[PDB]
């Protein structure tokens, strides 16, 4: 299995802040990296796929970059609705594996 590691488990910030979430794979996954967001009401949404492709109906303040085993997500201006937990997933080989998640909080 390809292990995904989201170093920071919890991140604190202020609305308006520019935030970045990193995700590391145990081996090159050729940009087959997807980001999911789990909102406080329990819903999960696909945000970005194939490293930087923003999915349908996702705000432009969300962006992704990366290659090899290094990837990160960036929110240009932290909005109240952005308060949630983000998970990265590799779709390079089965079994699909996800990172542990990163909880976003205010302050």
């Amino acid at each position: 299995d390809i292990q995904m590691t989201q170093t920071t488990s919890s991140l604190s910030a202020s609305l308006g802040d520019r935030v970045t979430i990193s995700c590391r794979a145990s081996q090159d996954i050729n940009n087959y990296l997807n980001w999911y967001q789990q909102k406080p009401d329990g819903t999960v949404k696909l945000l970005i796929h194939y490293t930087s492709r923003l999915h349908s109906g996702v705000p432009s303040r969300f962006s992704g970059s990366g290659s090899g085993t290094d990837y990160s997500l960036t929110i240009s201006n932290l909005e109240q609705e952005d308060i949630a937990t983000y998970f990265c997933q590799q779709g390079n080989t089965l079994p699909w594996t996800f990172g542990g998640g990163t909880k976003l909080e205010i302050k």
């Binding site: 488990s9 997807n34 999911y36 329990g42 999960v44 696909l46 997933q89 996800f98």
Partner: protein
Amino acid sequence: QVQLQQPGAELVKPGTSVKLSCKASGYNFTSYWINWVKLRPGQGLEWIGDIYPGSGITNYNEKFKSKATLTVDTSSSTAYMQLSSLASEDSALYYCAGQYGNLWFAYWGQGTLVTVS
């Protein structure tokens, strides 16, 4: 439109079994794969397996082979996952997600929190 509906919670006793349901709504159930993932807070997200409702073929994380059994009811458009010999380690949030638009985890259910006493 397209949507997956699962019950919000399940209270189970250890050693027994449980069958989680996932009802698909506005699309051709027979045409897409169904994914089941497990979320233990602080213990990461884990892919359990897939199942193509139109053929019945399944794919399993060999880590959940002897624990989860994926099945479907083509008539009621419901996907099922049975968890056997429930242990406290099985207490987690379980989502089913469907493939759509060439993406494997395109739509998600709201999840079913399973608590084994």
